[PDB]
């Protein structure tokens, strides 16, 4: 039923940037059937085998003085270069989130949901206040969700039986607004 | 670290297909389409700030296929062992009646990168304006993929994401319906 065996080879060149381009590190990785076999780590400057399968390639590639010179240099020619190219629309991308509050039930209301949609980048702080007192216990969340199209979303819920006369406020802080967003949900 | 940029390629036999894409912090920047031999940007505004020479990517894949036959043999022809995906269906944003939305079917933590995905509206397969990402990388060397179905949310309709993969017994149906 298409039961034929599969053989899979994957390559990853990862550039890791710490504090801008101040410190950059390269990992070239060769992966056979989901096991990494050889790797080039800019911090070593030679290939090392990771499994027995990789030993031939590491020895062989380490003989090509040309290849090695090229990769050692790659942290300039490839990583820092590309960072430059894309910086303007990847690193500095900001997309403000949309915030909605709305009541709910649990698998008469018992749940206040605070939805935060369509923001970038991923890091956000969402908090619940009753009048002015932050509510910490009884908050549950979906955690940060990535949509795959350069936005994120999250739901942050608060288990409460809302008493009338109280104001619940969901407050969001995010690198795209220079002042926190709020949404009230009264009585 | 602040950020990571991954150039990620693969080649898979016997299906004889390989992708080449760039990832920034887990989002796709662009892939190269082996079929139409050109570069495809994940968002239009990217292709008007930067560009990429697609040709060289084919060069890499040809090499990758070469290497794949070398490894298949060197490993004494031992094949990949299937890892079945996990799937959740999600909307783009909280749904309001008669405003456009998108159903997201998120397929995660599986290998090899071959998965058949079909959308179902009230049980009939539907395909109008659907779209997909390429297979995206993970640090464990499994894959992720997103499938998209734009829709006008109504009380009437129920939707399903059906995912078939070599690692699963029967296929996975993941349900969603307006509340």
């Amino acid at each position: 039923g298409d039961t034929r065996p599969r053989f899979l080879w994957q390559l990853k060149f990862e550039c890791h940037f710490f504090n801008g381009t101040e410190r950059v590190r390269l990992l070239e990785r060769c992966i056979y059937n989901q096991e990494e076999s050889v790797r080039f780590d800019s911090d070593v400057g030679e290939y090392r085998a990771v499994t027995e399968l990789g030993r031939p390639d590491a020895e062989y590639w380490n003989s090509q003085k040309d290849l090695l010179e090229q990769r050692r240099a790659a942290v300039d020619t490839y990583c820092r270069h590309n960072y430059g190219v894309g910086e303007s629309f990847t690193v500095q991308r900001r997309v403000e989130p949309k915030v909605t509050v709305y009541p709910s039930k649990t698998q008469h209301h018992n749940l206040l949901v605070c939805s935060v949609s369509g923001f970038y980048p991923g890091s956000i702080e969402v908090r619940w206040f009753r009048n002015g007192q932050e509510e910490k216990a009884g908050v549950v969340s979906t955690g940060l969700i990535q949509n795959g199209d350069w936005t994120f979303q999250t739901l942050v819920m608060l288990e409460t039986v809302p008493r009338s006369g109280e104001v619940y406020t969901c407050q969001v802080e995010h690198p795209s607004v220079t002042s926190p967003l709020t949404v009230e949900w009264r009585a | 670290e602040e950020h990571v940029i991954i150039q990620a390629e693969f080649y898979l036999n016997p299906d004889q297909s390989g992708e080449f894409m760039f990832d920034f912090d887990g989002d796709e920047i662009f892939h190269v389409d082996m079929a139409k031999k050109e570069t495809v940007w994940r968002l239009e505004e990217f292709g008007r700030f930067a560009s990429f020479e697609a040709q060289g990517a084919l060069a890499n894949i040809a090499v990758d296929k070469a290497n794949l036959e070398i490894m298949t043999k060197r490993s004494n022809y031992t094949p990949i062992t299937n890892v079945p995906p996990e799937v959740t269906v999600l909307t783009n944003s909280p749904v309001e009646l008669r405003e456009p939305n998108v159903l997201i079917c998120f397929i995660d933590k599986f290998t090899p990168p071959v998965v058949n995905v079909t959308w179902l509206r009230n049980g009939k397969p539907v395909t109008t304006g659907v779209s997909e990402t390429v297979f995206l990388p993970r640090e464990d060397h499994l894959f992720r993929k997103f499938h998209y179905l734009p829709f006008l949310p109504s009380t009437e309709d129920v939707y399903d994401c059906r995912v078939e993969h070599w690692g699963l017994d029967e296929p996975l149906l993941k349900h969603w319906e307006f509340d």
Binding site: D57, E59 | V63
Partner: peptide, 15 residues
């Protein structure tokens, strides 16, 4: 417009 660079895969060892 900047042009993104890529790294070239190099061929392994055969017998």
């Amino acid at each position: 417009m900047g042009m993104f660079n890529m790294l070239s895969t190099v061929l392994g060892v055969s017998i």
